[PDB]
Structure formats: C-alpha cells, structure tokens
Design a protein around this ligand. Structure first.
Ligand code: ZN
Ligand code: ZN
Lengths: 132, 134
C-alpha cells in the first residue's frame, strides 16, 4: 500500500485531540493538540508539513518518512491507539496517540476515526513521493 | 569547565518562558513553557529530568548529554536575535534546545535576556556535565 503522506496528515484532523511525540537521542517532548491548519514549505533539507498552535509548533520532513504504522497498546486498564511515522532506519520520527480526557475516556467517535484511517490507508503503508 | 546538569536545569527556572525544541531524524516539536516543577527519576535507561504540564510532558536522559552550549542566533522569519541553550549528545548533535520564548519578534520578558547572560556567565558559553547525580 502506497499513499500520499500529505493527504494522511491532513486526515489526522479526524482523530481529535492527540498526543504528539517526538524523540531525539536523549529527550522526549509529548504535546497535546489536534492536527489542523497544516501548511507546507519546501527547503533545502526537505519538504515540510507544518503547524502552529498556541502551545506548540510542529514540523515534519515528509521526505524522510519511509513507512507509517498503526499500533495499539495497553496503558489504567485501557487500550492505547498510536500511529508511527518511521524513517529509513525504521525508527519512529513522530508518534501520534489518541488523547483521552480522564484515563481511558476517549472523545466521541475518536477511536472510530482511528479505525477508519487504518481501514482506508492500511495497517502499514509507504508514502508516495512527496510533491508540494 | 564541568557543572551539575541537575543544578543547571533548576537554574533555568530563572529564564522565564522558554521554547523547548526536540528534533528526531525527521520531525521537530516546539513547546512553550517555563522550565519549572522539574522532577527526577532513575529509569532503566538512566537518570531523567522531567516535567508534566497540561499542554505537554517532557523527559530528558541526563546521562546522554555530553556538552551544553549557549548561542545567540538570528530568526529566519523576523531577522531578530534568538537566545538558545543546546544540549549536545555524543554525536555533537542537539538532543534538546531551549530558546527564550519571544512574544512579538525580538520581544522578551523583562529581565529575561539579562538572566540568560547571567546564566551564561555563571556556567560558561560551553560546559560539560559532571557525572549525573541527583
Ligand atoms: Zn518551528
Ligand atoms: Zn511522558
């Protein structure tokens, strides 16, 4: 399965509140927010998807993402729902988790929206070449 | 010279609102907030500095930082001066950058830039963490 990473990122707006996770060699930042109002720009280093919210800013070099995977886990006694954006080394450059309110209480239709994306794009898939 | 990374992170509370930047191989996340209410924990992979706010959670493996550098830069959009603290790993790559958070372009909080220079003078423009201890 091969799909547009741009289309997919925009489609993540349907997931409601997310926990966006980016990890370096030594740090982790886990930001709470909804994906929306994405803007794109091409630079020397890559073709970027970008977001500016009140609490945080986000940039994704779409050209470096080789595969996207859906994943569930266990937290409390409840299921977690994640989407991983993997790089050439098969390491997660970005992870998106559905964000609950009180522990395990997801937003109405949120878990459904996640399954809808997984069914539409597939369990694991590779992005098509990026064109801005 | 060498200093305690723990003491340094505690001292960062004096810098007011920061912009915490963590970069992976392909993504950048920037979160706005003061470095305050830090808590430490020893995990399997090492001693971590952490923060929990409503908007974000932050974790730093202190044992992986080999060098810390103060840098004044210039913003791409605005052409205004930026003030950063970069936490380098063993590859001399920034595992975390803390920027003074600007309001309007080049606008900082009262005493904030002076506080950055004071911290820089106290720790040095480039310094190395001591073996991590809480
Ligand atoms: Zn940015
Ligand atoms: Zn966390």
């Amino acid at each position: 399965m091969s799909h547009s990473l741009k289309d997919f990122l925009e489609a993540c707006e349907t997931l409601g509140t997310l926990r966006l996770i980016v990890t370096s060699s030594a740090a982790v930042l886990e930001a709470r927010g909804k994906i929306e109002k994405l803007f794109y720009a091409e630079l020397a280093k890559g073709k970027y998807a970008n977001m500016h919210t009140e609490g945080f800013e986000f940039h994704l070099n779409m050209e470096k993402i080789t595969q996207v995977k859906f994943e569930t886990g266990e937290a409390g006694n409840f299921t977690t729902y994640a989407i991983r954006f993997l790089d050439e080394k098969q390491e997660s450059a970005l992870s998106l988790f559905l964000q609950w309110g009180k522990p395990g209480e997801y937003e109405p239709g949120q878990v459904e929206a996640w399954h809808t994306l997984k069914e539409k794009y597939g369990e694991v898939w590779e992005p098509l070449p990026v064109q801005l």
